[PDB]
Ligand binder design. Sequence first.
Ligand code: NA
Ligand code: NA
Lengths: 248, 249
Amino acid sequence: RPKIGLVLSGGAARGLAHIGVLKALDEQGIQIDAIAGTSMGAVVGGLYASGYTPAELERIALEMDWQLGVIQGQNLAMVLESLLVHTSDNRDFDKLAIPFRAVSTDIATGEKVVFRKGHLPQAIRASMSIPAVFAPVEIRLLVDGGMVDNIPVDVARDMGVDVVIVVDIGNPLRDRKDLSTVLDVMNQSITLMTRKNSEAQLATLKPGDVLIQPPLSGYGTTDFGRVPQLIDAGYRATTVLAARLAEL
Amino acid sequence: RPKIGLVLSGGAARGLAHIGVLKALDEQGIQIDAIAGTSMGAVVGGLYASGYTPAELERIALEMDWQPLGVIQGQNLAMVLESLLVHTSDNRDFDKLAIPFRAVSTDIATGEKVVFRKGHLPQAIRASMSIPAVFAPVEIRLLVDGGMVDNIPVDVARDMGVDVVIVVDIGNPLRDRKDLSTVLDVMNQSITLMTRKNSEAQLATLKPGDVLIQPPLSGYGTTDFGRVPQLIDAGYRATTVLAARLAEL
Ligand code: NA
Ligand code: NA
């Protein structure tokens, strides 16, 4: 039987669609041997790697307050430590329920930083440290890994997997009418280079592999008003490929 | 004889080294048939394309004040450029300037490269120079600094039909850990990162025939205009050193 690696692309609000993919994949009895994730893909995939069920991930997403950069940085770190209190005495990420890699960016040098050991919470928090939303973290000064490897196919392949299931939740560009402020222009820039490394990795997909691309046409990148829809989106997108995933 | 295209990479303060390259190139009698530039490379190269001498470019750089806010500086930069270029008002096609010229910019809405080849020289150069968080973007497409898509526009210059390119890379140094204080700092760094990545890509396409000039700018702050004379000397000396290699064009 083939080793299957699950790659979970970066985002924020949009990355809760990852939950619905897991929910489908589990239902369909697809066994994941390795997970690689950036930002939200790293949160969802990390919690799942640690032992959470997609159903519990769903319950947690529907029951918490998504309603300055440093204060939110600490708040995110304390939530992650609470959820992961059961993996305190873990150090090697290969020895979690499922092997797991988070991906982050060394803001000083631009180098990709793949975590494979240490403190799961702290590593996941690095991968999730979106500039102008969560302060970077010091472990190297570290940020959201979207700008270097948003869809870390190659990371997952260096865990020795034969096939990858890749979930691209997309990073839509802002429309001309929404580019009001200077912050808006620069996020757009980050979005542009994020897509460019994303497209590059997606280029390396082979015959064997499976791309999942949830229908998220409507969906605001930071908009957590529609969780149930986001999760359904990933659920349905994956349910549709039940036939193709079956042959793994 | 070969058609020589001069490519002038993007920057800000560091791009005044471009002046010293022109100053050398002229001295050495190297004839330029086409110019392509981004940001500062576009200002210096555009003014030179229009008929300024490198000497006058140097005089202008040594005698002016580099000492809601993004927009006010945007207008100020536009009025300076219109003053300097008042003689090319009735120009429309950039191929009919003293030297053919292309400025390069970025459509911030779509990420597409925007190469200007016609219209109003000042307005186009101002687009190429519209560095986010320093000069408001311009509406012509909402347009910014072309560094993020083609900082070293070798391919633009080659689409003007040149056989050889002289490329001036002034570099975009990354900020060190100790200088990354604010959120603005982190995001500039990001822009720097993608700027280098497209820069390295174009530099990859250079051939046997072509000539890369890379001024010694080790010290130099990207926004630091306190050392103009050094910046110009840097480009001057870097080019003077290759007098032999440029001679065979
Ligand atoms: Na340390
Ligand atoms: Na550090």
